[PDB]
């Protein structure tokens, strides 16, 4: 295929409920937003913005949104499994690095800076992997995983030590813009993009409609929020045919990890319906 | 020891947050309750009551409180692990029946009727166990697990088929009154009580102060609610010395399952502090 693939992930029970709660907090704002369509009050424009942000943080990990109860130490042996258990996306990734840590490879992961980067590292300490960060921060393996910010790197204070290609570039959140100059640099080190996408979540909406309407388009923001709200009851659950692949811990993907030139083994990004303002109001009544 | 033992359990991340949310919903009522100490308005008396009930349902399983997103089928192979993952108490019990299913034994479990009973069954379908219910409802193993209501049985429409002792009686919730005539009947079938107690939760409060003050005592209700609210930041986390035992999946308890006459391997119920109305107001400001 194209070198640009999505890897759908699940949602925790907790991740599903937090999203249902985020939507409900913004109930009034959502209706105000679709009602007075053709002015968009900034109280309300930004109420939708923060809603999509919050739903997006949860989609990757609930700790990005709700701090307390978070382990004082992210370094203890129990942490990696605790984090995977509370994010369907971390789980998928944990299964993925379990396959690639079997290889002599440099693998790149791009995600937003800050706490996302520290939880990614916390997680990867449960894999047999070297971890390199390029933000001056942090807490005998054949595979090294490099963590890059999606919001600006700085290769002249932190150069790539590698020497070798990145065999794949993983996108953890929809915060990553793979077209930016810094990521296009990583992709050409001598590279396939796999995007971790929680099914039927804001990630899935941003991705799919990101084609459709592009930019900070009118119909983009609207379709993305209508679908986030409406699809909110089908968060993180896979079509029945994907289920054995994930249950078998993504072993399905080994031939593709062997030959990254081989066609992507999984279905293309599932289409998301175009929803009406009336579609959204129905969903909110229920 | 005495034949009456507690088995501390953990809390899910989701279980901890729901409890922090339940407490917060009742913020005003809690302060009103401790403020006008010496009249207790029933609006407020029952506000504390429902708070303790809700915190107690979550302590056993969040689905007892928040229905939606709950699997349409509790019978599919994935369900048992999904339920254990969302209740620290279900996890402990899953580890426990993994030990005892190795034996030719009749094991009794008492819990409140209704959905608690259906989730207990859902869970136990993931163990190599026979399951008997005595409430006319439901969805080659050496071990059979009998599920009894804590709120009245009816042995003359559903008699014990067993023929053999119950080697242990497990208390899932604080809903079980082991002194009642129906449970004292089960305990003498020719029996050790193990109580599944989520640490630093309402279960732990009811148990500990249930000695202390007994009955629907004045100081009982008050100490139990002050401690629930105050201990709400230390929900479900074990003292460091218990952690390998649970990490090693309760294998620590096998010699005791071999000889139930052997002294209980674990520490006695940890004491809970007596808290002030001023103690509770501090906790609520923070």
> Tokens for B187?
């305990």
Short-list A135, A171, A172, A174, CA closest to A152: A135
Residue of chain A whose Cα is closest to the Cα of B82: A13
Mutation pick from A13, A72, A240 vs chain B, by most beta carbons of B within 10 Å, is A13
Short-list A195, A192, A149, CA closest to A172: A195
**DSSP assignment, residue B189?**
-
In this structure, which long-range contacts are made by residues A270-274, counting pairs with CB atoms below 8 Å and at least 24 apart in sequence? A270/A199, A270/A204, A270/A208, A270/A239, A271/A208, A272/A204, A272/A205, A272/A208, A272/A209, A272/A223, A272/A227, A272/A231, A273/A227, A273/A230, A274/A223
Q: What are the angstrom distances between the C-alpha of A84 and each of A68, A87, A122, A127, B158?
A: 18, 5, 10, 12, 44
Chain A segment 47-76 residues within 8 A of B by beta carbon are 62, 66, 68-69
- Answer yes or no: are the C-beta atoms of B19 and B201 closer than 8 Å: yes
Contact B69/A12, CB-based, under 8 Å?
no
Contacts of B12 in chain A (CB under 8 A): 14
**Alpha carbon of residue B193 to chain centroid:** 13
A88 part of contact set with chain B, CB < 8 Å: no
- Answer yes or no: are the C-beta atoms of A32 and A46 closer than 8 Å: no
Contact A13/B62, CB-based, under 8 Å?
yes
Short-list B32, B25, B11, CA closest to B84: B11
- Answer yes or no: are the C-beta atoms of A192 and A168 closer than 8 Å: yes
A78 part of contact set with chain B, CB < 8 Å: yes
- Answer yes or no: are the C-beta atoms of B145 and B129 closer than 8 Å: yes
**DSSP assignment, residue A153?**
-
Domain assignment of residue A233, given as a range = 1-286
- Helix (H), strand (E) counts: chain B: 12, 6
Q: What is the DSSP string of B41-67?
A: -HHHHHHHHHHHHHHHHHHH-GGGT--
Distance CA B102, CA B84 (A): 20
- Answer yes or no: are the C-beta atoms of A180 and A137 closer than 8 Å: no
Distance CA B6, CA A130 (A): 43
Tell me phi and psi for residue B170, to 5 degrees: -100, 135
Beta bridge partners of B7: B196
Which residue reads 């009851």 in tokens? A233
Q: Find the helix packing angle between A27-35 and A42-60, rounded to 10°.
A: 130
A201 part of contact set with chain B, CB < 8 Å: no
A240 part of contact set with chain B, CB < 8 Å: no
Q: What SS3 state is found at A274?
A: coil
Q: How many domains does chain A have?
A: 1
CATH of the domain at A179: 3.40.50.12360
Give me the residue from B14, B78, B247 closest to A13, CB to CB: B14
Q: What are the angstrom distances between the C-alpha of B149 and each of B12, B56, B155?
A: 25, 17, 11
Tell me phi and psi for residue A130, to 5 degrees: -85, 145
Q: Find the helix packing angle between A27-35 and A277-285, rounded to 10°.
A: 160
Q: What is the DSSP string of A29-50?
A: HHHHHHHTTTT--HHHHHHHHH
- Answer yes or no: are the C-beta atoms of B79 and B125 closer than 8 Å: yes
**Alpha carbon of residue A8 to chain centroid:** 9
Beta bridge partners of B193: B4, B169
Q: What are the angstrom distances between the C-alpha of B285 and each of A113, A250, B17, B30, B205?
A: 32, 47, 17, 12, 22
**CA distance, residue A13 to nearest chain B CA (Å):** 8
Short-list A252, A267, A200, A159, CA closest to A9: A200
Distance CA B109, CA B193 (A): 10
Contacts of B236 in chain A (CB under 8 A): none
> Tokens for A1?
């295929």
Contact A14/B16, CB-based, under 8 Å?
no
Length of chain B measured in residues = 286
Distance CA B105, CA A146 (A): 53
Starting at the earlier edge strand, list the strands of the sheet with B105-111.
B4-9, B193-198, B168-171, B105-111, B143-149, B130-133
Strands B130-133 and B143-149: parallel
**Residues followed by a gap in chain B, C→N > 2.5 Å:** 139, 190
Short-list A168, A172, A131, A175, CA closest to A151: A175
Strands A105-111 and A130-133: unpaired
- Answer yes or no: are the C-beta atoms of B28 and B34 closer than 8 Å: no
Distance CA A161, CA A28 (A): 51
């Amino acid at each position: 295929t194209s070198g640009d693939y999505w890897l759908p992930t699940t949602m925790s029970l907790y991740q599903k409920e937090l999203t249902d709660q985020i939507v409900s907090l913004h109930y009034s704002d959502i209706l105000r937003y679709f009602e007075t369509s053709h002015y968009k009050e900034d109280v309300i424009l930004e109420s939708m913005k923060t809603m999509c942000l919050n739903g997006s943080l949860v989609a990757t990990h609930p700790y990005l949104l709700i701090d307390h109860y978070m382990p004082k130490s992210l370094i203890t042996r129990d942490v990696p499994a605790h984090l995977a258990e509370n994010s369907g996306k971390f789980s998928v990734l944990r299964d993925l690095i379990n396959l690639v840590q079997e290889y002599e490879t440099e693998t790149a992961i791009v995600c937003r800076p800050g706490r996302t980067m520290d939880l990614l590292e916390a997680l990867l300490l449960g894999n047999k992997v070297h971890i390199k960060r390029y933000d001056g921060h942090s807490i005998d393996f054949s595979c090294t995983v490099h963590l890059f910010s999606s919001e600006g790197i700085n290769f002249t204070k932190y150069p790539i030590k590698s020497k070798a290609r990145f065999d794949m570039l993983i996108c953890l959140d929809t915060t990553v813009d793979t077209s930016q100059k810094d990521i296009q640099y990583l992709l050409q080190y001598k590279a396939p993009i796999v995007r971790l996408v929680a099914i039927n979540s804001i990630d899935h909406c941003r991705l799919f409609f990101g084609k459709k309407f592009d930019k900070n388009s009118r119909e983009y923001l609207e379709n993305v929020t209508a679908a986030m709200v409406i699809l909110r009851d089908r968060l993180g659950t896979l079509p029945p045919d994907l289920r054995p692949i994930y249950s078998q811990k993504l072993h399905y993907l080994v031939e593709w990890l062997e030959n990254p030139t081989v066609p992507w083994p999984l279905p293309d990004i599932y289409p998301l319906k175009q929803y009406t303002s009336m579609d959204v109001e129905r969903s909110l009544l229920t």
